[PDB]
Amino acid sequence: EKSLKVLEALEEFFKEWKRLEKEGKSLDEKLHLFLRVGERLLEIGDKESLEMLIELLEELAKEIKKAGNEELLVRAEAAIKDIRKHIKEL
Amino acid sequence: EKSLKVLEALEEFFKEWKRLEKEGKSLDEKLHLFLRVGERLLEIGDKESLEMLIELLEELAKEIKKAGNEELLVRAEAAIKDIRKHIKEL
Numbered sequence: 039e040k041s042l043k044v045l046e047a048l049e050e051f052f053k054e055w056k057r058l059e060k061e062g063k064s065l066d067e068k069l070h071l072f073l074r075v076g077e078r079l080l081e082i083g084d085k086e087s088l089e090m091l092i093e094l095l096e097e098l099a100k101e102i103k104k105a106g107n108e109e110l111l112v113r114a115e116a117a118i119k120d121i122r123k124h125i126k127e128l
Numbered sequence: 129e130k131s132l133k134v135l136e137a138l139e140e141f142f143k144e145w146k147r148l149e150k151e152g153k154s155l156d157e158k159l160h161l162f163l164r165v166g167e168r169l170l171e172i173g174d175k176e177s178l179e180m181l182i183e184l185l186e187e188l189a190k191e192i193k194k195a196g197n198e199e200l201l202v203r204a205e206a207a208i209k210d211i212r213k214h215i216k217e218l
């Protein structure tokens with residue numbers, strides 16, 4: 039049933055990511071989506087779903103750094119580091 | 129049905145906060161619980177349930193400041209600022 043929970047979380051993430059991408063709905067909404075899905079998958083406790091989340095969060099971090107938002111970058115980097123440490127300890 | 133989702137989120141928050149206060153857990157599990165509940169309440173559409181979370185997160189940040197962790201206080205402060213801005217815009 040853990041696999042079913044991971045599948046539901048990933049389906050929600052995919053649908054929300056697709057809807058956000060075919061729009062212009064700011065970087066903050068995308069970061070909130072990533073953080074929500076990351077916390078859900080951390081309460082589930084499965085790897086191989088947090089590593090792709092980490093890679094996509096690095097993509098978002100690059101996008102934010104190329105822009106002019108210095109307060110969103112610190113939250114993105116803190117989330118990335120925390121998820122990396124949790125993956126290492128998981 | 130919005131109120132029912134808010135009630136479910138608050139029920140999960142209360143139960144897990146009771147658990148984490150009972151079994152002497154780390155200061156990171158509490159922050160992860162707060163972030164999870166805050167993101168869920170931000171996603172629905174609720175205020176007047178996000179100000180109590182702001183109060184409790186301010187108390188948790190006060191606890192973190194006098195603990196000895198500096199890379200954990202930045203995440204809490206960033207979350208407080210983002211939730212406060214979203215409350216203002218909501």
Ligand SMILES: [Zn+2]
Nearest residue numbers: 120124156160
């Ligand atoms: Zn953590």
Ligand SMILES: [Zn+2]
Nearest residue numbers: 066070210214
């Ligand atoms: Zn935000």
